[PDB]
Design a protein around this ligand. Structure first.
Ligand SMILES: [Ca+2]
Lengths: 56, 222
């Protein structure tokens, strides 16, 4: 379950704010994404995040 | 920028901030209407901010201009990061001492050349601390061999390493797309690395001298 994976910033150096599902907190949180090599627990909005992972 | 120093207000006139509600990448002004940055900094709704020092407060020397076009290199590879270069056309031309363009290189720089890297990225290697003002870092270009030994099978002919093998001085998240200027010419674009300021893990940059023809022609036909 990719929804349980920790957020992945990646090797690139942008500071792009994305969302990841935090199973411990039971909610989607923000984190800094570097701009490349995104894993699946990486969403552009909280709504996308909740729709895909909500309740995992 | 980890281990750098405060550049000083508008001492890097070609430095721009790409803003999408907040600073997410840097870029260089190479023409009154064109900015060069990294392809991984591609985003919709980009507003370019020029004449910036403190990115959090309006100081009076700024020019915010939205992008009208964003052209990513046709051969940019998101997996390998090869050809990590992008051109942004401003909706209107910038008014050029505090805002000025940087020259494209006539030739590639050699290992050992000292360059100036700048940006508003993270200043901590172990932690998160984003500065208000622009940070600067002088780092030398490293040889192709050491760059390749640092990142086995990951360095292409379009990338170069710069920094210190001891670590402590490097670019970091939020610096992407920014300039690596050597001898007054734009030689690199902040691109990727492994963590920030880690020992034996120098930063990797897009080798600009390899794209000068594409840049000049692309700007002219758009
Ligand atoms: Ca400002």
């Amino acid at each position: 379950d990719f929804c349980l994976e920790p957020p992945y910033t990646g090797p690139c150096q942008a500071r792009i704010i994305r969302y990841f599902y935090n199973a411990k907190a039971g909610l989607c949180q923000t984190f800094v994404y570097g701009g490349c090599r995104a894993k699946r627990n990486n969403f552009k909005s909280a709504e996308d995040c909740l729709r895909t992972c909500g309740g995992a | 920028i980890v281990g750098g120093y405060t550049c000083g207000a508008n001492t890097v006139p070609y430095q721009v901030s790409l803003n999408s509600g907040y600073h997410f990448c840097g870029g260089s002004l190479i023409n009154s209407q064109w900015v060069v940055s990294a392809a991984h900094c591609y985003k919709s709704g980009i507003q370019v901010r020029l004449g910036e020092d403190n990115i959090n407060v309006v100081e009076g020397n700024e020019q915010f201009i939205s992008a009208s076009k964003s052209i990513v290199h046709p051969s940019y590879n998101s997996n390998t990061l090869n050809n990590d270069i992008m051109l942004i056309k401003l909706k209107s031309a910038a008014s050029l001492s505090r805002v000025a363009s940087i020259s494209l290189p006539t030739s590639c720089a050699s290992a050992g050349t000292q360059c100036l890297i700048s940006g508003w990225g993270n200043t901590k290697s172990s932690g998160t601390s984003y500065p208000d003002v622009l940070k600067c870092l002088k780092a030398p270009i490293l040889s192709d061999s050491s760059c390749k030994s640092a990142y086995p099978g990951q360095i292409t002919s379009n990338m170069f390493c710069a920094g210190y093998l001891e670590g402590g001085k490097d670019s970091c998240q939020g610096d992407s797309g920014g300039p690596v200027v050597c001898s007054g010419k734009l030689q690199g674009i902040v691109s990727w690395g492994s963590g920030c300021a880690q020992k034996n893990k120098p930063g990797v940059y897009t080798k600009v001298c390899n794209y000068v023809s594409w840049i000049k022609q692309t700007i002219a036909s758009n």
